[PDB]
Amino acid sequence: LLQKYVTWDEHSIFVNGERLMIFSGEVHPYRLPVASLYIDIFEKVKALGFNCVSFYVDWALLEGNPGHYSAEGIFDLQPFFDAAKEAGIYLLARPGPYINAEVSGGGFPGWLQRVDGILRTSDEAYLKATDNYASNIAATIAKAQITNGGPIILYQPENEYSGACCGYNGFPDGSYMQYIEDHARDAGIVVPFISNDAWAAGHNAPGTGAGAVDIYGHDSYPLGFDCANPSTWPSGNLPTYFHTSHEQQSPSTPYSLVEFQGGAFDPWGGVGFAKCAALLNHEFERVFYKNDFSFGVAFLNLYMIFGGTNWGNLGHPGGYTSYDYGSAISESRNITREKYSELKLLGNFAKVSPGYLVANPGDLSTSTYTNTADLTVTPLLGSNSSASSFFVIRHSDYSSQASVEYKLTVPTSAGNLTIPQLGGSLTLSGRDSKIHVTDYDVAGTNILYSTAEVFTWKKFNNEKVLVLYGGPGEHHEFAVSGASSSSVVEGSSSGISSKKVGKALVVAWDVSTARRIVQVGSLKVFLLDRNSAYNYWVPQVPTKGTAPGYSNQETTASSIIVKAGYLVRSAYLDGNDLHIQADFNATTPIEVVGAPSGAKNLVINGKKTQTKVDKNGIWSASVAYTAPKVQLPSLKSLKWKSVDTLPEAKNTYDDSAWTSADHAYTNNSAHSLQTPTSLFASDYGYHTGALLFRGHFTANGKEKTFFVQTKGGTAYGHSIWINETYVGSWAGTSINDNNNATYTLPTLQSGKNYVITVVIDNMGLDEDWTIGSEDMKNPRGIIQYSLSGQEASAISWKLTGNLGGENYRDTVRGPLNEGGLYAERQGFHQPQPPTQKWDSSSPFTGLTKPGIRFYSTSFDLDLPSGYDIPLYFNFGNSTSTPAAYRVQLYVNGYQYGKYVNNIGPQTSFPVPEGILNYHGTNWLALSLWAQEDNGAKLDSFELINTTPVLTSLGEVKSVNQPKYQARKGAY
Ligand SMILES: *[C@@H]1O[C@H](CO)[C@@H](O[C@@H]2O[C@H](CO)[C@@H](O[C@@H]3O[C@H](CO[C@H]4O[C@H](CO[C@H]5O[C@H](CO)[C@@H](O)[C@H](O)[C@@H]5O[C@H]5O[C@H](CO)[C@@H](O)[C@H](O)[C@@H]5O)[C@@H](O)[C@H](O[C@H]5O[C@H](CO)[C@@H](O)[C@H](O)[C@@H]5O[C@H]5O[C@H](CO)[C@@H](O)[C@H](O)[C@@H]5O)[C@@H]4O)[C@@H](O)[C@H](O[C@@H]4O[C@H](CO)[C@@H](O)[C@H](O)[C@@H]4O)[C@@H]3O)[C@H](O)[C@H]2NC(C)=O)[C@H](O)[C@H]1NC(C)=O
Ligand SMILES: *[C@@H]1O[C@H](CO)[C@@H](O[C@@H]2O[C@H](CO)[C@@H](O[C@@H]3O[C@H](CO[C@H]4O[C@H](CO[C@H]5O[C@H](CO)[C@@H](O)[C@H](O)[C@@H]5O)[C@@H](O)[C@H](O[C@H]5O[C@H](CO)[C@@H](O)[C@H](O)[C@@H]5O)[C@@H]4O)[C@@H](O)[C@H](O[C@H]4O[C@H](CO)[C@@H](O)[C@H](O)[C@@H]4O)[C@@H]3O)[C@H](O)[C@H]2NC(C)=O)[C@H](O)[C@H]1NC(C)=O
Ligand SMILES: *[C@@H]1O[C@H](CO)[C@@H](O[C@@H]2O[C@H](CO)[C@@H](O[C@@H]3O[C@H](CO[C@H]4O[C@H](CO)[C@@H](O)[C@H](O[C@H]5O[C@H](CO)[C@@H](O)[C@H](O)[C@@H]5O)[C@@H]4O)[C@@H](O)[C@H](O)[C@@H]3O)[C@H](O)[C@H]2NC(C)=O)[C@H](O)[C@H]1NC(C)=O
Ligand SMILES: *[C@@H]1O[C@H](CO)[C@@H](O[C@@H]2O[C@H](CO)[C@@H](O[C@@H]3O[C@H](CO)[C@@H](O)[C@H](O)[C@@H]3O)[C@H](O)[C@H]2NC(C)=O)[C@H](O)[C@H]1NC(C)=O
Ligand SMILES: *[C@@H]1O[C@H](CO)[C@@H](O[C@@H]2O[C@H](CO)[C@@H](O)[C@H](O)[C@H]2NC(C)=O)[C@H](O)[C@H]1NC(C)=O
Ligand SMILES: *[C@@H]1O[C@H](CO)[C@@H](O)[C@H](O)[C@H]1NC(C)=O
Ligand SMILES: *[C@@H]1O[C@H](CO)[C@@H](O)[C@H](O)[C@H]1NC(C)=O
Ligand SMILES: OC[C@H]1O[C@@H](O)[C@H](O)[C@@H](O)[C@H]1O
Ligand code: NA
């Protein structure tokens, strides 16, 4: 349309005039604030055989101060774009403005609570509020487009623009979407627009007029988000109508799933992400992802591939600090989960199967393709008698854990066949699915059929290599057209049959843990068991330079096959040295297949390695691994300093400099006031972290009770004092976002002045999932209050959140990082705080009454270089009845954890190298808020590490860590 780099037809997208099956993974740059680590994520995604990454941009972090867009330092997107280009990964940009994503406000900055218009509509005030951000982010993305030499190939306007409720009846608003599209185009965006409908409803599909996107897309999370029963696969959850709906809604464009389940989020009081990983495990992937291929999906993006962390209060109340998501790449960036290895098998299959893109998806059947109704097969038939076809098979009841025997009856260029032709039966184990192929082209050689699945294939000079695999206890068969015989060139010939049937050479075999290589003419067929295949990698090999380049026919053709361990990042040829960059977490046997003709030596991670070659031309070597010593400090033994971070509870506290909560009106269009003046924090520019309110009044002696309704979001809590006297606390629960309470008060003297201090923990702002719900506008603060014997107006209020509010103090760490606690307002959470005159008390001693104390200490690290080592701060929780207390974890000024002992479920908090300094000094700080009469203290709090990984990853550069500085106007 506006450019020729990215085009499409009914079958697929074309990049540079070449068909490309887009297999993408979702990654959020703001959830990993360490620029030097972006390359690690991209290389791990590229190693799966993927060629694209989808990302959101969080507006709340870029325009915290209305009118000032800021995306520099850790918020700079350039290093993210650079890493993508370096790794050879294209990008789908999804800037919102609304992104949902389980982040605070669903992306909306807190000041949107003051906008007089319904969010995500054509209301004038809302549209105008988005103009500054939209112009800036679109301009940034425009420069990184493929048309300008960058990685960005697609652009998503809005997010799940799929429904409305609660009084808003303008959906679907054609001019609303057209407005977002026009503005992006006006800012320079020329790549195609792709949508992500919540369900297959055809919203904004081509031909729908104003607002229509270029390529219609939709999302799907068939197993839901409740990970409590990981082995339970509900009846009917597997979708079977995606192809039918696609042909009715957008037949002119490639079938696209812009967001397909790759894990699940987890709420406060949830079950933990380990269970989400177990629900969306490797079995889920092979069954559901192959099911997507049965529909002929041409663009598939998995949400999330890497989740990261909701550091610095960036998340919503519907979730906690961690955003591990149970995805293939863990929060600490590791790839030990079996689902990662399984996904690699499918990604690599797609990367070498262009015939799949031009096959025609058909109707599923329980009788046409096998001899048993217990199995369902969906065909993707070739255009003509000689074109390749694909058959996706699964149990008819997708949740079945049964093992079923069968015979395949499919059409081929040689007629309708009944496989296995040489005898025996095929097997489909519990919760497994396979893609059987017919007339599969391997560089000119026709594989009439193969029951075992294809991992990859390559042509090296005149030699052709095909890698097949089967699951445990399976019997398979394949046939090569025009071949005359075969020879077993590796392994025993036991269990392998070879015979000519018609004009094809048929080979039968049984899966084994021992690899077998069968030579059929110029074709070498590797016969593997699934678990051995897990250790194979297919790195591209650059002609010149070290970067692999984007994925296309040429770069795919010159790739090599490497059997190794934990990870293979890349490979390149320099002179006669073949360089391979890899990671190891154990002693690892190495095998290189297809080394370039000019390659004479093998260099692994810069080290010359002793290599030997076998009969099949395979290079072999070994990499030894020895767990290094990792010296970590004992947190309990460090020297701690602490200070009372609730000076407001003293009669000497002066709040004159605090903001006066004197607005006799609210700017919140979704909530009318119930108090004399607004006590909604956002009306005064305070949208993040602890919020404090102080109500001044002169007693008349008739007071008895103080009723109050506070609101801080799901799992929040509050504590109250009247002058120096403790009144009470609401410790919170996983199902409460607000609380009503009538507190009795101690006797007061008529004529004297008192101040009621209310401390409220803000858990973030809500998303606005359904247009018209205005949920994002749910306020934070005091909703109602009543002091018996007194008029409400008798109380004059002061309030404070983070120092400066929207005019936040930490431009480096962002608008959400710090809250309103005294120590935070002073900047004591940063490196080198002024602890000279502080008390020498540690969090292991804690408090003996309700209150809040701030702790500080430091420790040095000097971890072994050459290793990628994940570090975690772990809190103990072994008691039956949990004490009620809240903790905020600060590392070198960055808040990396909110711990609520009585709500959970997170006890282990990972912090990446870059935030933590592995070869320098580190400043640790904690706020400890006791919400029970007996006070609170930590019994177990440690810094621990997981398996050290011998890596080729470059040394991580520490991010900017601004030190403490006395702040003007602080209080
Ligand atoms: C360094 O990094 C690496 C990554 O690069 C890390 O390695 C990963 O570690 C994961 C553990 O955290 C592991 O995942 C768990 O796997 C458990 C084992 O089950 C799987 O493997 C069985 C085969 O075992 C062989 O392979 C595995 C590795 O895949 C290895 O650990 C074993 O020692 C063994 O290796 C030997 O053989 C291979 C070749 O085969 C060689 O390469 C090796 O050198 C060794 O010689 C496999 O049978 C099993 O599959 C069956 O079961 C699953 C369900 O669990 C079915 O889906 C599947 O269909 C199949 O079932 C059929 O067949 C069986 C057998 O006939 C039959 O009985 C059934 O009826 C059915 O017909 C798996 O692939 C697994 O138990 C575990 O699951 C957990 O527990 C429960 C299950 O009880 C589960 O529900 C929970 O969700 C939970 O996850 C995990 O899945 C990864 O596989 C592994 N990846 C790699 C690449 O190795 C390594 O940890 C790290 N090291 C350090 C120090 O950090
Ligand atoms: C450290 O380990 C400890 C364990 O040792 C662990 O503590 C457990 O944490 C879990 C998860 O947070 C707790 O389980 C949840 O508890 C929720 C809170 O339950 C209480 O509060 C409810 C709300 O009360 C207020 O609001 C309601 C209306 O909103 C109002 O009526 C009330 O008056 C009040 O204002 C309340 O409804 C609930 O009442 C039930 O239970 C009591 C006690 O038996 C009973 O008398 C009542 O009749 C009623 O049955 C209770 O008072 C709870 O809401 C939540 O349940 C929801 O979610 C689950 C899904 O997880 C759903 O299955 C369920 O249907 C609900 O939707 C859930 O049960 C658990 O209580 C803790 N265990 C202990 C011993 O304290 C820590 O989290 C760990 N910490 C870390 C860091 O990991
Ligand atoms: C703490 O106590 C408060 C009440 O003091 C609880 O909130 C009430 O909860 C009940 C039960 O869910 C709700 O009852 C529903 O009311 C519907 C009608 O709502 C309108 O009329 C209400 C009465 O005047 C009014 O309060 C309410 O205002 C809300 O919506 C407005 C527009 O959306 C908004 O401008 C206001 O700011 C406010 O948010 C509506 O105008 C009725 O149709 C339902 O059948 C049902 O009866 C009350 O509406 C709730 N009241 C409020 C103010 O929200 C709260 O749940 C308690 N907290 C806990 C944890 O228990
Ligand atoms: C890779 O990263 C993941 C995510 O951070 C790490 O997973 C966490 O691993 C720990 C330890 O195995 C899990 O805790 C354990 O849970 C079991 C089950 O309750 C319990 O029996 C053990 O005593 C222990 O508590 C934790 O649940 C898990 N968390 C998540 C989100 O999955 C993993 O450790 C990392 N692996 C490596 C090698 O770095
Ligand atoms: C409750 O606290 C308030 C302060 O918030 C007290 O009032 C201040 O008292 C100090 C002396 O301690 C004076 O210097 C200030 O001028 C007072 N300011 C106000 C608002 O009057 C108040 O006296 C305390 N009440 C009681 C009974 O102790
Ligand atoms: C081959 O099998 C198909 C079923 O897929 C059937 O429709 C056809 O009649 C059979 N014979 C032909 C035409 O090859
Ligand atoms: C908030 O309300 C006040 C009073 O009506 C008004 O002056 C101000 O412009 C409003 N702010 C916004 C952003 O609408
Ligand atoms: O994690 C669930 C995801 O579901 C998608 O539909 C949504 O667009 C994402 O923003 C996220 O909420
Ligand atoms: Na827990």
Side-chain angles (χ1 to χ4, degrees):
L1 185 65
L2 303 176
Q3 48 72 56
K4 304 176 180 180
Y5 290 79
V6 186
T7 62
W8 69 87
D9 69 5
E10 325 69 51
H11 289 289
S12 78
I13 291 176
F14 290 70
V15 177
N16 294 310
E18 212 180 70
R19 286 186 184 289
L20 183 69
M21 186 284 145
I22 311 295
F23 215 145
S24 179
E26 185 89 5
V27 178
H28 298 164
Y30 55 83
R31 269 159 162 146
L32 177 57
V34 183
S36 49
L37 288 177
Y38 291 145
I39 187 60
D40 179 55
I41 305 302
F42 281 115
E43 296 188 312
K44 282 165 177 170
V45 171
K46 181 78 169 178
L48 289 168
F50 282 28
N51 50 32
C52 182
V53 157
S54 174
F55 72 99
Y56 280 137
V57 177
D58 189 351
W59 177 14
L61 292 171
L62 306 189
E63 187 180 25
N65 190 8
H68 184 228
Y69 174 95
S70 175
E72 296 300 307
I74 67 177
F75 298 106
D76 195 332
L77 284 170
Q78 193 53 51
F80 189 69
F81 297 155
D82 291 341
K85 296 189 297 183
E86 184 61 60
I89 292 292
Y90 290 125
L91 298 174
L92 155 54
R94 318 202 294 155
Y98 185 71
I99 61 172
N100 205 57
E102 288 76 62
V103 300
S104 183
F108 293 145
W111 48 267
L112 268 295
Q113 298 207 335
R114 299 202 301 276
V115 176
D116 182 37
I118 300 174
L119 310 173
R120 304 180 66 192
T121 73
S122 289
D123 274 354
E124 190 65 1
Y126 172 71
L127 291 181
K128 287 178 179 176
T130 70
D131 290 332
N132 188 45
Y133 167 72
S135 297
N136 279 279
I137 193 58
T140 294
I141 292 171
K143 182 180 174 179
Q145 291 174 112
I146 184 172
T147 52
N148 195 209
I152 305 177
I153 59 169
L154 295 165
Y155 193 106
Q156 178 189 290
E158 246 283 336
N159 190 76
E160 291 193 303
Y161 187 60
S162 315
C165 79
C166 321
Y168 175 63
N169 297 283
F171 175 93
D173 185 350
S175 58
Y176 170 65
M177 286 294 281
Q178 190 61 52
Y179 181 98
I180 298 176
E181 291 154 3
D182 286 348
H183 280 239
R185 290 269 186 251
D186 291 336
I189 299 298
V190 295
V191 298
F193 287 131
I194 189 169
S195 67
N196 71 319
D197 217 353
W199 58 86
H203 293 130
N204 305 124
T208 58
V213 294
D214 296 304
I215 296 176
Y216 175 74
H218 76 90
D219 305 347
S220 174
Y221 293 78
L223 284 187
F225 303 108
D226 185 327
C227 317
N229 302 295
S231 73
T232 300
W233 282 16
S235 173
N237 283 38
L238 180 85
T240 65
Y241 63 95
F242 287 179
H243 171 240
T244 303
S245 293
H246 175 257
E247 296 306 332
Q248 307 176 312
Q249 310 179 336
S250 194
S252 67
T253 57
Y255 179 49
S256 310
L257 282 165
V258 180
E259 279 188 45
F260 192 83
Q261 183 152 42
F265 52 79
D266 192 49
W268 279 98
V271 300
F273 286 114
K275 279 191 169 56
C276 288
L279 175 58
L280 297 319
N281 72 350
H282 66 95
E283 301 181 316
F284 154 75
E285 298 183 318
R286 63 198 193 191
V287 173
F288 287 79
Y289 293 178
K290 289 175 185 179
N291 183 55
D292 292 332
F293 276 70
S294 82
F295 303 128
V297 66
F299 176 101
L300 176 60
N301 177 60
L302 307 181
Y303 186 110
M304 301 288 294
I305 195 66
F306 167 65
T309 306
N310 302 307
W311 67 277
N313 306 303
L314 73 80
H316 71 157
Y320 41 101
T321 305
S322 172
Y323 200 56
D324 177 82
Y325 215 76
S327 58
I329 303 173
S330 85
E331 178 168 23
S332 57
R333 298 176 296 102
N334 71 50
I335 54 181
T336 55
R337 291 170 176 162
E338 191 165 324
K339 62 182 294 179
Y340 176 95
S341 301
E342 162 58 47
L343 179 55
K344 182 172 59 176
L345 306 185
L346 183 58
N348 275 281
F349 159 79
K351 188 171 186 177
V352 300
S353 303
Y356 162 74
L357 292 177
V358 294
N360 301 300
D363 298 307
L364 66 77
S365 173
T366 60
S367 62
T368 300
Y369 305 108
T370 87
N371 63 339
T372 177
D374 291 322
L375 301 178
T376 292
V377 172
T378 304
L380 290 92
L381 308 174
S383 297
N384 59 48
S385 60
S386 68
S388 60
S389 291
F390 304 76
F391 304 81
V392 186
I393 187 171
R394 65 170 168 78
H395 290 281
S396 292
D397 176 332
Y398 91 101
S399 72
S400 178
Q401 286 277 41
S403 188
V404 178
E405 303 280 56
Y406 67 107
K407 289 190 178 181
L408 190 65
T409 52
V410 295
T412 72
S413 62
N416 295 326
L417 312 176
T418 294
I419 307 163
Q421 292 189 291
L422 305 183
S425 294
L426 303 177
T427 297
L428 187 64
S429 299
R431 294 186 177 182
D432 188 23
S433 178
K434 302 183 186 300
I435 300 180
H436 294 143
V437 302
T438 63
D439 292 303
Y440 187 94
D441 180 59
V442 174
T445 295
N446 187 64
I447 306 302
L448 184 58
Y449 68 77
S450 178
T451 61
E453 298 181 276
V454 178
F455 168 63
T456 195
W457 63 263
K458 297 298 164 191
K459 178 173 180 292
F460 303 123
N461 294 304
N462 294 300
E463 163 192 47
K464 297 177 182 179
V465 172
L466 172 62
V467 183
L468 303 178
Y469 67 93
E474 284 163 29
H475 174 265
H476 289 288
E477 193 184 86
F478 68 85
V480 187
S481 296
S484 289
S485 188
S486 67
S487 315
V488 181
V489 295
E490 189 191 291
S492 171
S493 62
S494 172
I496 298 183
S497 301
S498 178
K499 176 181 180 183
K500 282 192 60 59
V501 183
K503 298 181 178 180
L505 186 285
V506 184
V507 176
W509 60 292
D510 293 316
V511 173
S512 171
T513 57
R515 173 179 70 188
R516 267 71 54 65
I517 299 184
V518 178
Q519 186 79 48
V520 182
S522 59
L523 174 70
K524 287 191 185 299
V525 190
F526 286 53
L527 306 181
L528 309 173
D529 67 305
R530 181 189 294 113
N531 296 77
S532 288
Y534 282 166
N535 296 316
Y536 282 64
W537 309 84
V538 194
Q540 295 177 186
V541 180
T543 31
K544 293 177 181 176
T546 59
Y550 296 112
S551 299
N552 62 43
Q553 293 302 69
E554 188 172 63
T555 62
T556 291
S558 57
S559 296
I560 56 175
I561 303 169
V562 182
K563 176 185 172 63
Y566 190 71
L567 175 67
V568 170
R569 296 172 183 282
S570 61
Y572 65 85
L573 185 64
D574 176 52
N576 57 51
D577 292 321
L578 175 59
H579 285 265
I580 294 180
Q581 286 55 65
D583 282 41
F584 310 92
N585 71 337
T587 298
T588 307
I590 303 295
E591 286 185 57
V592 181
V593 184
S597 58
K600 300 178 180 178
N601 305 292
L602 180 64
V603 181
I604 300 180
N605 294 5
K607 299 182 178 180
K608 298 181 179 180
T609 310
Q610 178 172 297
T611 304
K612 295 184 183 302
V613 60
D614 65 24
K615 184 280 163 53
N616 292 296
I618 304 173
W619 282 18
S620 65
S622 178
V623 175
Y625 171 98
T626 299
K629 209 289 184 175
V630 181
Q631 297 189 58
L632 301 175
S634 176
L635 301 187
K636 187 172 187 176
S637 297
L638 294 176
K639 165 74 172 182
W640 295 85
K641 301 298 295 183
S642 73
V643 64
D644 182 341
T645 187
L646 189 61
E648 295 86 344
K650 296 170 187 166
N651 295 315
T652 55
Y653 192 77
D654 171 25
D655 63 16
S656 295
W658 288 38
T659 299
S660 293
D662 60 2
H663 295 180
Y665 60 91
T666 179
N667 288 94
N668 194 136
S669 69
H671 299 82
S672 60
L673 293 181
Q674 288 175 266
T675 55
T677 66
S678 172
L679 296 178
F680 295 166
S682 285
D683 271 323
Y684 302 92
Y686 297 114
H687 320 113
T688 186
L691 304 170
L692 290 84
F693 296 74
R694 284 170 66 79
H696 297 267
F697 74 95
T698 298
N700 59 14
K702 300 181 179 180
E703 302 82 358
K704 289 183 180 180
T705 62
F706 180 65
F707 164 74
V708 66
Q709 167 180 32
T710 60
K711 187 165 196 168
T714 303
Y716 89 112
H718 77 229
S719 292
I720 304 174
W721 283 263
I722 181 160
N723 270 64
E724 313 191 322
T725 307
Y726 180 67
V727 175
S729 291
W730 162 240
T733 76
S734 60
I735 64 172
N736 291 98
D737 73 359
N738 72 285
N739 187 75
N740 295 305
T742 300
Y743 296 105
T744 55
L745 300 167
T747 302
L748 309 182
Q749 167 169 48
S750 180
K752 279 192 173 180
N753 301 316
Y754 294 94
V755 58
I756 293 174
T757 302
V758 186
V759 187
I760 304 174
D761 199 13
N762 183 358
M763 309 305 282
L765 305 184
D766 304 329
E767 298 171 310
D768 194 51
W769 198 56
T770 309
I771 304 174
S773 78
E774 295 289 73
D775 292 341
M776 178 266 155
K777 292 182 178 173
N778 274 309
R780 298 292 179 255
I782 297 170
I783 311 302
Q784 294 181 273
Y785 80 76
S786 184
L787 181 62
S788 70
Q790 289 250 45
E791 289 294 301
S793 55
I795 304 181
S796 294
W797 303 84
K798 281 286 195 175
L799 93 166
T800 190
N802 70 103
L803 184 62
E806 271 156 31
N807 227 307
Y808 58 102
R809 299 304 179 105
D810 199 334
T811 57
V812 172
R813 299 190 186 78
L816 311 183
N817 192 62
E818 62 182 60
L821 297 180
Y822 167 72
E824 291 178 298
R825 304 191 306 252
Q826 296 293 319
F828 297 162
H829 58 291
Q830 297 170 291
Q832 294 181 52
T835 62
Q836 179 179 61
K837 296 182 176 59
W838 284 23
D839 302 307
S840 291
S841 188
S842 92
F844 292 89
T845 290
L847 300 71
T848 55
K849 60 177 175 57
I852 316 180
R853 288 191 70 75
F854 192 74
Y855 300 83
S856 162
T857 190
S858 61
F859 62 84
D860 298 322
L861 289 178
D862 182 46
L863 309 190
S865 59
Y867 292 84
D868 193 356
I869 313 172
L871 260 52
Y872 296 72
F873 282 90
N874 290 5
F875 293 81
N877 187 37
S878 56
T879 62
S880 57
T881 302
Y885 68 83
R886 295 166 181 264
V887 172
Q888 293 183 94
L889 171 70
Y890 282 103
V891 176
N892 293 138
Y894 288 87
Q895 197 257 70
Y896 250 81
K898 291 203 64 170
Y899 179 79
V900 188
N901 200 66
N902 52 300
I903 299 180
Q906 185 169 23
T907 56
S908 185
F909 301 74
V911 179
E913 184 178 359
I915 294 299
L916 272 172
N917 308 310
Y918 283 21
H919 305 87
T921 304
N922 292 280
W923 294 85
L924 176 61
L926 311 168
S927 62
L928 174 56
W929 183 350
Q931 292 195 289
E932 44 175 31
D933 299 332
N934 57 309
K937 63 184 174 61
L938 305 178
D939 295 312
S940 184
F941 178 48
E942 320 180 310
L943 175 57
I944 63 85
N945 76 89
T946 51
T947 308
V949 177
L950 185 58
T951 186
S952 53
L953 183 63
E955 191 177 302
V956 175
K957 305 180 188 301
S958 289
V959 306
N960 189 180
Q961 290 161 27
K963 297 179 182 179
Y964 159 79
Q965 284 179 159
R967 298 175 167 186
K968 184 180 179 55
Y971 50 72

